[PDB]
């Protein structure tokens, strides 16, 4: 038998009840929501995400999230969230709408989930099914390695794929992650990533860059650039799939031009 799924229809919103909130650090949370029963699973294919939607101060706000739970978890879904507080970053004085709304929720409040969504699904053993658009059929391709470039909150789509690969001992796909952040303190999910490196270093390569570095720093400083892509992603000769998720100036200026300078086919670099 298989467990009942929560996300039965992508066109339906499912209000899920908040049952636990962990303060991971000053501006990081883990939110656990109950599924419809303790025996349900979410029903989120690897590669896909959900949306949260809410009326936030009277206006509709919809944002995508990739849980840190998986379909192996029964009864709950966990989201790790970076809270963007107002009056902290000079370019974003209002902070972030959905992340501050999540931070204001009380235990027992509900929020609407919808899914699954996304043009990419990982079918296992190196094989990705990628739609060019919703309204189009998925181009499958079995790669030997995956280059992953995440910035900030773009880590969770990568982590979901990395974990799905690592937990299959017969999946020989090698993942190379280059993870960019504003500062060391702002990095999400560092213990989780380092546990994966500890356990799976032959299939999982991990590197960080930070816009500005701490005094004691073992990794890179600056935006993603050509040299970092040469040093920390598989070479284009090996035809890796390249996955990206990060802010717009990062993808547009740091990632795509430099993936091209190295020789990866730009038009095949997938952005979540
Ligand atoms: C597939 C996918 C999966 C994702 N999964 C996750 C996830 O698991 N967890 C998660 O936290 N997010 C995730 N995100 C990002 C998420 O969709 C939102 O972008 C994020 O929650 C911020 O939304 P917001 O409404 O709070 O901010 P908005 O109101 O949309 O703010 C716009 C932008 O302003 C910037 N900003 C605002 N305030 C600050 C500040 N103080 N400091 C720095 N920058 C600031 C941020 O870059 C922010 O994205 C994911 C995105 C994608 C595409």
UniProtKB/Swiss-Prot annotation:
Domain FAD-binding FR-type: 11-123
GO biological process: cholesterol biosynthetic process
Annotated TM spans: none
Classification via SUPFAM superfamilies: Ferredoxin reductase-like, C-terminal NADP-linked domain, Riboflavin synthase domain-like
Effect annotated for changing residue 65 to A/F: Protein destabilized, release of FAD accelerated, and kcat values decreased
Impact noted for substituting residue 49 to A: Similar properties to wild-type
Catalytic function, reaction form: 2 Fe(III)-[cytochrome b5] + NADH = 2 Fe(II)-[cytochrome b5] + NAD(+) + H(+)
Phosphotyrosine: residues carrying this PTM: 14
GO molecular function: cytochrome-b5 reductase activity, acting on NAD(P)H; FAD binding; flavin adenine dinucleotide binding
Main localization, broad class: endoplasmic reticulum
Effect noted on mutating residue 49 to E: Increase and decrease in Km values for Fe(II)-[cytochrome b5 and NADH respectively
Chain positions recorded as FAD binding sites: 63-65, 80, 82, 84, 97-99, 156
Effect of residue 66 to A: Similar properties to wild-type
Membrane association type: Lipid-anchor
Keywords annotated in UniProt: Acetylation, Cholesterol biosynthesis, Cholesterol metabolism, Endoplasmic reticulum, FAD, Flavoprotein, Lipid biosynthesis, Lipid metabolism, Lipoprotein, Membrane, Mitochondrion, Mitochondrion outer membrane, NAD, Oxidoreductase, Phosphoprotein, Steroid biosynthesis, Steroid metabolism, Sterol biosynthesis, Sterol metabolism
Subcellular compartments: Endoplasmic reticulum membrane; Mitochondrion outer membrane
Pfam families (UniProt xref): FAD_binding_6, NAD_binding_1
Domain of life: Eukaryota
Family affiliation: Belongs to the flavoprotein pyridine nucleotide cytochrome reductase family.
Protein name as catalogued: NADH-cytochrome b5 reductase 3
Organism: Sus scrofa
Gene it is expressed from: CYB5R3
């Amino acid at each position: 038998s298989t467990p009942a799924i929560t996300l039965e229809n992508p066109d339906i919103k499912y209000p899920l009840r908040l049952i636990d909130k962990e303060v991971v650090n000053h501006d990081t949370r883990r939110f656990r929501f109950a599924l419809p029963s303790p025996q349900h699973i979410l029903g989120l294919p690897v590669g896909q995400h959900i949306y949260l939607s809410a009326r936030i101060d009277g206006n509709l706000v919809i944002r995508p999230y990739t849980p840190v739970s998986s379909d192996d978890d029964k009864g709950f879904v966990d989201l790790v969230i970076k809270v963007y507080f107002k009056d902290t970053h000079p370019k974003f004085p209002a902070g972030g709408k959905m992340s501050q709304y999540l931070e204001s929720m009380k235990i027992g409040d509900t929020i609407e989930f919808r899914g699954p969504n996304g043009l990419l699904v990982y079918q296992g053993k190196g094989k990705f099914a990628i739609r060019p658009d919703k309204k189009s059929s998925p181009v499958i391709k079995t790669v030997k390695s995956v280059g992953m470039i995440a910035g900030g909150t773009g880590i969770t789509p990568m982590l979901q794929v990395i974990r799905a690969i690592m937990k299959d001992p017969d999946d020989h796909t090698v993942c190379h992650l280059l993870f960019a952040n504003q500062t060391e303190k702002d990095i999400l999910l560092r213990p989780e990533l380092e546990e994966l490196r500890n356990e799976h270093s032959a299939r999982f390569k991990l590197w960080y860059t930070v816009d500005r570095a701490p005094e004691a720093w073992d990794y890179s400083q600056g935006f993603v650039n050509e040299e970092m892509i040469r040093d920390h992603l598989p070479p284009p000769e090996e035809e890796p799939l390249v996955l990206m998720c990060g802010p717009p100036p990062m993808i547009q200026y740091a990632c795509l031009p430099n993936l091209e300078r190295v020789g990866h086919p730009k038009e095949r670099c997938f952005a979540f």
